[PDB]
Write a protein that binds this ligand. Structure first.
Ligand SMILES: O=c1[nH]nc([C@H]2CCCN(c3ncnc4[nH]ccc34)C2)o1
Length: 167
């Protein structure tokens, strides 16, 4: 039993809710919240900008130190950093950005990072300002993630479309 509330069950292990991931993290305080990161951990907009803003920029400060030490992530890769006031940990995962021409096949590699964590609160990777089709992202999620994932979809219109079109 866990504290996630109001989710629709899509499969054995994937759940979905129309929710602001920032507000959901603040309420549940999950072990892991996933950030829709880029390779530079520059949290300017989208989910990343919103999560970082909610940490009062502490996520960005920590991220800048991480990059200065380790260099950029790979597209499809991830790193575990603090969850600050939102979660125990933040898993920063880099989905391909279609608006940069990155290979959509890397979306499966990106979701594989979730399998290293038993339970996660997450957005749909590569959706929103990353330019991919969110229906496709949900399909890859369901077909790749085997651990328990609670997906937060900000847009109510998109949430209803994802549910109604789910196979
Ligand atoms: O307006 C739109 N069009 N496409 C989106 C998705 C992609 C980027 C943001 N993403 C989120 N998912 C869950 N929580 C969130 N908080 C803030 C953002 C957010 C949804 O948003």
């Amino acid at each position: 039993v866990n504290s996630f509330s109001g989710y629709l069950k899509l499969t054995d292990n994937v759940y979905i809710k129309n929710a602001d991931i920032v507000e959901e993290a603040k309420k549940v305080k999950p072990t892991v919240v996933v950030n829709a990161a880029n390779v530079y951990l520059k949290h300017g907009g989208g989910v990343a900008g919103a999560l970082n803003k909610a940490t009062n920029n502490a996520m960005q400060v920590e991220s800048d130190d991480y990059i200065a030490t380790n260099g950029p992530l790979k597209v499809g890769g991830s790193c575990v950093l603090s969850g600050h006031n939102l979660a125990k940990h933040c898993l920063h995962v880099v989905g391909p950005n279609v608006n940069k021409g990155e290979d959509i096949q890397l979306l499966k590699s990106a979701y594989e990072n979730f399998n290293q964590h038993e339970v996660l609160l997450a957005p749909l990777l590569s959706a929103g300002i990353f330019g991919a089709d969110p229906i496709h992202s949900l399909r890859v999620c369901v077909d790749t993630v085997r651990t328990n994932v609670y997906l937060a979809v900000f847009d109510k219109n998109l949430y209803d479309k994802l549910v109604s079109s789910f196979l």
